[PDB]
Structures are given as C-alpha cells and as structure tokens.
Amino acid sequence: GEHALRRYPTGEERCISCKLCEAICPAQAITIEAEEREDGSRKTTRYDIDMTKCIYCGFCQEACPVDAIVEGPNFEFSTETREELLYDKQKLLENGDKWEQEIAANLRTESLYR
Amino acid sequence: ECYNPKGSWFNPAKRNWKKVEIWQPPQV
Amino acid sequence: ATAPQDFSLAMKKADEIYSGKTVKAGDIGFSAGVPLETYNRKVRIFCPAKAASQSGLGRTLHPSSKAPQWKIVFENLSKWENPLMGWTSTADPLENVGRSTLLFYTKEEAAAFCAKHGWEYVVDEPNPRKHIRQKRYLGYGDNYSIKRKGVPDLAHLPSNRS
Amino acid sequence: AEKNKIPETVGGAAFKGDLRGTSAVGLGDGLYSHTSKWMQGNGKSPMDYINEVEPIKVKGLVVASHGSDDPALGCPVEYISLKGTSYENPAVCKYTGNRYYSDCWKHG
Amino acid sequence: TNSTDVFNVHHDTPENNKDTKFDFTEANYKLVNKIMSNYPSNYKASAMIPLLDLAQQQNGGVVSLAVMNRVAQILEVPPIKVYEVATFFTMFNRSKMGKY
Amino acid sequence: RVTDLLIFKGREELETYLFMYKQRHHAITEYIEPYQIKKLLIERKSSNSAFLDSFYEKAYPLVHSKYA
Amino acid sequence: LPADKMEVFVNGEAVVVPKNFTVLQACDAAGVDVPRFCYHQRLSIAGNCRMCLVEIEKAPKPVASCAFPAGPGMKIKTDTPVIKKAREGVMEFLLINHPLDCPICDQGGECDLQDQAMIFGSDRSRFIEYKRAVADKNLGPLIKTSMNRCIHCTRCVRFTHEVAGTSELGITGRGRDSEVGTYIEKLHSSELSGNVIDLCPVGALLSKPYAFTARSWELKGTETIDVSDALGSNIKVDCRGTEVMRITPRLNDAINEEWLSDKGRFQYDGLKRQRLNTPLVKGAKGLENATWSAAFDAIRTAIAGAKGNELKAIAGKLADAESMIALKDLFNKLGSGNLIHEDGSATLSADVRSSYIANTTIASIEKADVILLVGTNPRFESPVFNARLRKVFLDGAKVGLVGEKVDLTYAYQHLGADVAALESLASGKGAFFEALKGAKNPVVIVGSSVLRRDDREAVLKTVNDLVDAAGVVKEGWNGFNVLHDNASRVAALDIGFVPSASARTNPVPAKVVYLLGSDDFKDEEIPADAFVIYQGHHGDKGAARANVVLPGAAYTEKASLFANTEGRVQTTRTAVPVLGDAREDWKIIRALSEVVGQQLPYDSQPQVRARLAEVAPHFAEIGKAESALWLNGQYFKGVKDLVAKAARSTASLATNISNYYMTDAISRASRTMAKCTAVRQQ
Amino acid sequence: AWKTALTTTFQELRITLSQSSSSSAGAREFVLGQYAELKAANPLLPILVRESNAAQASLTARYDFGVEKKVSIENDSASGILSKLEGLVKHGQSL
Amino acid sequence: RDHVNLQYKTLIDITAVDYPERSARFEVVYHLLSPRLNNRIRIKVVVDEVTSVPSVSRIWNAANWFERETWDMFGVFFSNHPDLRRVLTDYGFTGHPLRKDFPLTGYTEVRYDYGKKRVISEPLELTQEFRYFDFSSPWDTLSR
Ligand code: SF4
C-alpha cells in the first residue's frame, strides 16, 4: 500500500542512501540525493516518491538492504490535488511513524517466509 | 490543506531548487 | 580476438550475406517522418574512454571487447529545475536516445548512419592505448636490479679496508 | 557566516576537522545543514535522537553489530574495531549509528 | 592474551610522542659505525635491523618514534621504511618494557 | 524509392480526412488555424540581425520556443 | 617475428609479441582478459593478489601472468578448469574478511571486487568466523579511509613511492593484521594525492569531497580537458542534471598518462559558488540587474568616448581561443592594438612559435638524457609534468636547476639561484654544461617566471646562447622547452593577442578596459578612471571593479579551444548547460560588435574555427601537436638593439605561484581548495 | 628603404607556410633568410610566422581598422616573396 | 504451407527488428506452426528502409494486420498489400516509433487549451526527464 520510510527504535532513520531502490524502480518514481551528515553518516538530503507514477510493485521494498522503505498497510490515501500525491522525505517519515507497530508486526510475520 | 510540496506557494519558506550560489554585488 | 563462436557468428554472417541499397545522403531522413529540425542537430561520433575507477577493458576498443562501442551522441541542451519539486526538466527529445541505443561496431558504420539520415557529424578517434611498461620497471626482476643504487661498492670489504 | 564557512564534520562517525561531502542542494535557497535541506520544521531531528543514545561498553577488541537484536531484521553484520576507544571517543556502526567502546586493549 | 603491542599504528603516550628526542651515545655511535662498515656504502639501509636492535638495547627495550626517526635519518631513508621494519619483526618492542 | 514512400504517406494523410478517421477539430488545429494566424500576424521588422535576436532570446538557439 | 618480436601461443592462437612482454601482456595482445587486482601498467609489478594465475604447459603449478616473463613457443591456457577453480578460491580468500559495506561503499557501482566476484567467483560463502577489523586514520582533507575494505594490493604504496615520490604510505604489520597507511598521523602532501583514490580497486581510499553524494550509474560523463594549467590534462566530467558531481582523468599518453592533479580534480566545488548569472550595469546604487540590450547600450555609450589605444583588452587565464579572436577582431575594427594578457608577460614576442612552446613533446621528454630547469618549480606549475620528470630521473637522467631551492620529488643539482649562474653556465664554464654537451638528448626547460620578468629578453638570449653552445637543438631532436602555467597564454600568442607597435611605442592611458575573464590583472593596468567591462563567470576582483558585468559560460559549459604548453590544440565540450542569462563568450563579443556598429563576419562556431584556422593553421589540426621550425636564433638576431636595451633586475629566478591550490577564480571560490590551503598552513 | 616602412604601414604581418612541402620551399627560404633583417628594421612590428603540415603558404598584412589583404606565396621563389611584400606595402600606402 | 511433409498451416506473427549498425537495417521475422509436425519455424528477410517485402496475405490471411503493424512501427513497406494503413499510432503520426533512432518519449505532447476549446498537440516538454542508468561493467563478457 502507501509507502513509508522507517526509523530505528533509537529514532535514527534506517535509510543509508544506497540508492538501490531508485535503480530498481520500474517506473522511475523515486528520486534520491544524499550527503555526508555532520556526524559522518551516509544520509539522504532528499527522498521523494511520485505516487502518481508508482505502480506499487514492491520492488523497492525488496531491494532495500536495511528495511528502510516499506509499503504500508494503508489504502486510504486519496487526495483532492495531485501535488499532495508527490511525497517527500518528511511525509514518508511521518507515514512510517504513524504505522510503525503494524508495519513491524507484518515484517516480523513475513521474515519467517522471507 | 495540510501537506504540500516545499516549492508550493502555500509553503512558509518557498524553495527555489537552485543548485548554484549567485554572486552578490558589492554595496554602492 | 580469436572468435566469439556463438550467436554472433550467425549475426556477422547475416551481415556479410546481405547488403543495403545506396541512396542519396539525407533522403532516408525524409522517409523517417521525424521533425526535420532534428537533423539540424550536430553529431559527435566517439568511443567512450575507460573509467579511471575500474581496470576492465570491456568498454574500451580492445580485442577483448566484442560489443558495439562507438556511440552517436547529440549536443547537450538546456535543463532546468521543476519549481515545485526541483526535478530536472528538459525539452530535448534526443537527450538519451544516442547514448542508450545508438551503438555501432565501427566508426564507418556510424558515419554511414549519420550521412543516411543527414546529420552532420564529427568523428573523434580514441586516444591510443599501448600496454608498454617503462624501462625502469619493465619486469618483476627490474624491481630488485642493481639499477636502484648501482653495483654494490666493495670498498667496505675488510681486505679492501686493510 | 555559514555562507562562507567550509563544510565540516562534527566527528561522531568522522574526524573533528574533516571536510564534509556536500552536494549543491539547497545552495540557492541558502541552506547549508544536512537536516535543514529536508526538514522545514522545528522538531527534533534524527541526528538529535542518535546523539542522545549513549555509548555501550563491550568486552573484546571487536564487536559484531547487526543493527537490531535479530540478525535478519536490521543492518548487515559488521565487525567494528574497539582498539583505541573510550566513552568520550567511541566507535560507531555506520549502518545504525550505535556507539561502542571497550577497555580490553588497555589490558583490562 | 595479546602481547605487549596491540597497535600497529603509533599510540601517543607521554613517554612516546613526537617531541621525545633519542640519539645514540658516543660509544653506541662507534658501535653504529662498526655495524655500518659491514654493508656497502651505497646500500646503507642494510643496517636497519642491527641499528634498531642497538637502539632498543640503549633505550631500555622500547623502540620509540624518536628511535625510528633517528635511525631513518642516519640511514638516509624515508621514515616509513623504518616504521614498516620495526612493525614487521617480533623482537622490536614498540611499547614500554620492564627490566626483564 | 524515397519518393514512392513519401507519396504513399501523403496519400495516407489525405485518406485520414477523407475517411473521417481524423475529425473537424484536427483539421482546424493543424491546417486552417495556422494559415489564418499567419495572415493575421503583424510584426515589427527587426533592425537587429538574426544573430542578435536569437542571442537576446535564448542561449541555445536549437531549442524551440512555444507561443512565440 | 621480426628480430625482437617473438611468437607465443595463448589458448591455441598465435600471437607475435616483443621479447620484453610478460604473460599478461601477451594475453592482452591475444584478446584474452585476465582477472587482475594489484597489477597496474604504470606501477611496479607486485604479484601479491595472485588473481592472474594462468597455466603454462612447462610449469607444474599456475604462474602469475603479471610477473611471469613470456618465452618463445610458450603456450598459455587461461580457461583450463584448474584456473577457474584457482580463480574461485582466490576470490573466496579475498572476500572472507571483506566488510559487508556494499550499500554504504561509494565504490558500489564501480567496484572491481564485485564485478570479478560475479564473473570469476562462486555465488555463495562458507565463512562463519569473525572478520578482521581496522581503525581508520586521517590521510588529509581529500582522502577518506575505510581500511577494513582494503585488499592488500600495494598500488597506493607503489604510487606514493615511484610516482608521487612522497613515500608516506606503507604496509605496517605482518600477516592478517598487516595494515596500510602512515604509521604516524600524517596527511598526504603530494598534489597528485587524488590519484590513489582511482588507483584503489576496493574503495578503501575514497574522495572526501565526493562522499555519499551520488552513484556511478546516475552520472553522465563528457570527455573534456582541464584548464587548471597549460598541461591540458584530459578529463571526464560526470554530471547529474545541471550539476557537475566529479572529475576524473582520461588516458592520453601524450600529455597526462592517466594522472590528474588535485586542483583540477577537486576544483569543481568552486563552480557552484560566486557565479555570475545576469548582466550587471553600475548605478549610484551599485551593480544592478540589467538585460543584455541595456548592458550593450551602456558599452556602446562608453566606447563612443574612447578612441584608438584608449580601448584596452586584458585576457584572463581561462579565456578560450574563440573569445580572444573575437575580441581581437572587434578591437582592431574599432582601431585599438592595446591587447595584453594579464600574466605580466604581455610584451612577449609571438613572432616565432619555437620561442614560446615546448618544442620537445611531453612524451618525448622520456628519452632525455640530461635536463636543465631554468627558473621553474615544475611541481607547482604542473604536478603531472613533475611526475614525468620523476620518471626520467628514475631512468637515470641528470637534472639541474638554475632557480631557487625547491622541494622537487627527485634529487637534483642546484646550479645556482640567480641570473648570473645561468650566464656563467651559458658561457661554457660548468660541469653541468659539459654534461649537457655530452648528452645525446639534452632538454632545457624554461619556466613561465622567466617570461614574466622585466629582463626577459636578455635571460632568453642567455638561454639561447646555452642552446647554441650545448647543441640541445639538433637534427631529429629539439631540446628547448618553455613550460606555461596558464591555458590561454599559448593560444593568445598563436592568434597574435600581443600589443601593437603603436601601443608599446606611445603608451596611452586607457579610457575603456575590457576584461575577458581577467581577475589577476595588476592594479596599474586600469587607470582607475576607466570604464571597465568584465566578461566572465565568477565574481572576483575583476567583477568588483566593473561598470558593466557580462555573464559568460565556464569551461564545463562551452565548447572551446585551448592550446597546450606543447601547442597541441584541444577542445572542451558542454558538460552542463549554461546558467541563468549567460552566453558563450564569442557570441557575446559578436553581439556587442553588432551593437557598436562594427559587425563581425562570423555568425557560427565553425566560422569562428575557420577564422582561427586562417590566423593559425595548426588550430585546424585539433588533437595533434605541430612541430615548430627552429627560428629562435633569427629572432634574437632581429632583436639585437632591444635585448641590449633590457636592463638587469635585483630578482632571483623563482616561481610566481605562491599557493598552488588557489591560482584562479574557480579555485579561489572552491571550499575544498581553501581547506587544503588551511591544512598546509598550520 | 621600403623595409623600414613596414611598421608605419602594417599593424601586423603573417607568414603562413608548410613545415615540409615543395610549394612552401620558397616561403621557408624567405623566412629563414630575410625574417631577421625584416625584424631588425621593424623591431616592434609583430611578424607572425605560423606553420602546419597541410598549411598553404600565404602572406597576409593587416592595416588599420582591421583591413586585411592576403597574398598567396605558393611555389614562389624567395625573391618573389619579397616583391609581393613590397606590393603589400604599396597597397597599404594607397589606403 | 502446402508441402505434404512440411505443413505450416499457421502464421503465428510477423515482426521486424531494427539493427542500425547494419546497412540492411530491418530483419523481418516470420513465425509459423505446423500442427501435423508439432514444430515451429522462423523465417527472416533482411531489408533496408527503401526496399519492400512482398505481402504473404494470400498464403495466410492473418498476415494483413501483422504487416500493417510492421509498417506502422518500423516503416517497412509491404508490396501488394490490400490496404497498408497504420494501426496502433495516433492519427497523423508520421514517425515510426520502434525504430532505434526514435526518441523514447517522442517529439510531441497532447494538451487541452482553454482559449481554443480543442485538444491540441505541442512540442514535448518534460517536468522530470527520463534517467538513463548506465549499469554496464567493464569486466562483463556476455555483451556482443
Ligand atoms: S513499489 Fe515499485 S514503482 Fe513503487 S516506488 Fe517501489 S519500486 Fe518504485
């Protein structure tokens, strides 16, 4: 369903800007640009997904090595303007925060199979 | 009317995503 | 350099058996049906040089390489940033076609294609790569040669000292 | 000031005085911090979260870091050198940002 | 259960650091000259190990950074070579050593 | 041969209108409107040469201009 | 098999190779590609990685191709199953202790280790033990270290010793805990430091400025040249969208073997800062936004007042051939001959090409037996050129310097520090003179400092006296070379961008000064009441003193011609589009020519190139260096009275480059260069 | 005589020639024999000798205000080269 | 089709492949089925832009639309075709899209204008350009 960037339990984002999800995206819906953070971490300065270009294949969730990007269980995300459907890093992180427990339970169940 | 992109007119600090800093002429 | 000895054999054989009929330069471009201002664009026919990060010779024009390595590329045009999302916007229809799909085995093939469509072209030959080691380190033995500091002076010998 | 300052790294996972790898994003807008470029609010940043977490003492000269507690539900396994590490200057997991330090090298 | 040296890089210590000065004593320097005479003049770097052993014996059993730099200056070689040789071999102790 | 192909394609263009494949608005947009626009156009004869005008207009002359 | 050539069999196919090749060289000649990690063409053979193992029927066990000499009638098998198994085993040993850092490694899309793992390795592992761990250390502002990812090849150490010559890196340790780096905390001092990053196969050494910013597949590469100095190093500029992300060298054995200096590699940072985007016209409120027409109108009103030599042109370090020929034609049409170059060697004669170019090609300096460096610090002027002089020093060439004592990587004989020593050497009183005379291939290199000297004529006459006495110029070998520190100097001399007879004879206070990218002008050049037009791409000392500022494209944004110190004409490409309301410089000058009432004939880039071909035929031969007829002696016979007129100065032959990292406007804008300068000055 | 007057007449003088060619042999003789004398008479005048292998021999003089007159010097003896330069000087006098 | 031993009663499809490196760019491919032999055969005719291929519709009625599609996508003319017309592309389309020299996005774009109450075609502008990711390895050998 709706995409969501995830955080570690400490509150640090899981994303390490490998940029594999952008390379595997069949529709080219993900644009990523990154930098070195002041502490020294490899972190993204931009992570936006076009939900009017997404095909919800789930390939990006497959390619991510740290489980940073997941397709959440939410299918109620219609909008009244197309601009609200161009997600960005802050919106994706907020969506990950809102659905954290459900996503974690689904991932714990799914880990057994794969 | 809660979420809009950062380049939107509604955004408090609207962003022009220019990747080059421009020289500011000296005063007077 | 020996032979691929695979489907490329039949590929080359289909090439040498068959041939194309000669037409005046630029006539096919009218048959193509694309905007005629496309052929006003200038063409550069070049082979990419090797990336400095990697030491593989596949991308270079080397006897190891069996893939087409000569590209037709068009000149770069204006690019801007989307005011809303900062995406890179363009108006160039021919931005990625030449890099992505226009691959040719030989420079004359790309020149023939350009002359057939009517594109003006400039062919740039790659800088020659010769795998010649320098005389100082021509071989592994040269690393431990007397060249480093000269023949050992024997004036330190006890017989020579006394 | 930030307009003419050299981009520098605080040094948690880097050194105190190094250059910071920087792209040109935000250069026109006037933002020169990593978090400013992507967060427009005044809330707590994830870097503020990771700084709040304290370094953890371990035994040995190498610690295996899987990010999370379960190996297959976190970062790839990583082996971090604990030599020359203390509470003030801990080693860092690049994937997670967790900080570690050990006293074993001092023969303890 | 690691031995004296756990570091293959220089660990700054109040005893061992850049300001520390080591030089051969005059008698030890005469021994240095006799040691060097055994090897050809142009290939003078051949004496690196005997000189490092002599400096270790003089300095109480520790090969410090000043010792390595002094040996490198005497042999007219880049200091990294003396660092590499002092790190390769076992007898060279680069940490403080006891009486025995 | 190229002439033959071009003639066949032009015959196709005629047949589209003749067989009602294309519509009235297509004919308005692609033929009648531009021709009428050209007649209604008033322009000042530019004293600047062709180079100066394109130089003032854009950096890359090869890129098209819309709504000129 | 003519003489030196032998025959070898590789996989049952006959290959004819010289006797001095190895097994790997013949395998490359055969079209077979052997897996390598530690072997490098321009570095000493190591043989440590053991990934090149092939089979020789004569030998019982597999041999390393890189270090095995090939023999007549040798049969080489690179596809035997034993070799496949050995390749897989070596790959396993390479990967057992490698960190699982592929997502966070900046070598992710460009790693030799990954690619050879896929091609020549197994798909699965059997290692369950603890991996080795290393603690990284600072090597400077430009190099990032992840020594855990380090496979113990010796490419960085061999480069630092043989090529760079700072000899700072080594393998300290024994066995598995052996580590690479300075044992002490030291920062890599060579200006060729960036090359270790490219030489590193497995991302252990990485570029700190280009850290976590992009991946390889995202970048579009355009092959262009470096204007940082007059070497004209061939580079590949990688761009994402409208941003240049990184600059890396290209192979050109003629000029830059495969090495790039740090300034050229890391000056792209200053291409995003202090940029000029719009025309600016001065008012009471200062420089303000203006359209192209308004700026041209102001320039027209200014030029109307000035007449003849009152119009003055100063070209910059980064001006290209087309903009300079445009400005030359426009100002000659207006009636001015006051065309000078900012360097300070304005009056240097452009009459004979042999006088101001390196007549010996850069490649041919390899064959030099004795080299004399006059008033030049080749390290600062061109680090890669100093690398080649180091290569010839390694062969056994004897090098003498007649300038100030400088820290060249190699050892040299200090002949003297002042002009009088060169005078004595030219007269024939010197042991080094008897070495220059004896040598079969003598090379004399004169630096740009001698050209920017108030007594350049007599110093050049003394150098020519030495040339004639020692016979460095002979049939089949011209040993006279002049090294330049700027890209635009040789082109400006070639086109004829030199003050005219009237300008030198009767100096006229300039009323309008045109700056073609000149931010290094001497302050006396502008009379301080002149109307200054600055055309350029960064805001610097030039733009601050401008009544009208005309934005122009940079070397990354324009297709322009530059001439090397050897005179080889090379051309740039448009890597990224032009920013804002800026234009190509020759188009700006031609538009201004139309505005002012003297329209220039050319209206297209090929027409400009044809005009360049007319003014100098070699400009038509892009990519080829043209030989120069040795006319230097006739020139000095011509200028007899003038060289007598030239006096003596109380200055010693020395470089004019105070700080190497900042020498032009782009470098001064760069933040990375500022950090490098601060690190050196501490 | 007229060799003194090149400076007054010409703003610059260009001698294009081929490095090794039969057509440019006369130009090579002209440049390697009279260039020193012409420079001695006109020290401050820029006489630019530019050469390429495929270059076609020519003698070009630039007068005031950018007026340029090109004279082909191909397959002409060194004396003819001198005559052609004299004609260029006379043409400059006409202006 | 009609040989007793070889009875390829069916034409599965007709296709063309553009090879710009070759002088004879287009390779027209015919795929057939013999139900009796339970076998598939592939027939290739190598042509260029100017030459034409005789229509085989009289042998197999299914060919008509397949040859019309080949004409539309690649520009290969088929002689004696009953009515050779474009099938897939928009009315008024003159370019042949599957040619390797045709841009992926094309040359024109379609929008409705309020001023002229018509849907109109305009030159292409892209808000976000197509990003070509070059994944090729130097060490690869399978590339021919
Ligand atoms: S689900 Fe598929 S299309 Fe959507 S963002 Fe992920 S990879 Fe791209």
Ligand code: SF4
């Ligand atoms: S979301 Fe996952 S795959 Fe995408 S950049 Fe971040 S870590 Fe890489």
Ligand code: SF4
């Ligand atoms: S060096 Fe190569 S294999 Fe090792 S972590 Fe980096 S990308 Fe992965």
Ligand code: SF4
């Ligand atoms: S840092 Fe790179 S070049 Fe140096 S030894 Fe390690 S892998 Fe080799």
Ligand code: FES
């Ligand atoms: S390449 Fe020969 S052993 Fe490494």
Ligand SMILES: [Zn+2]
């Ligand atoms: Zn971890």
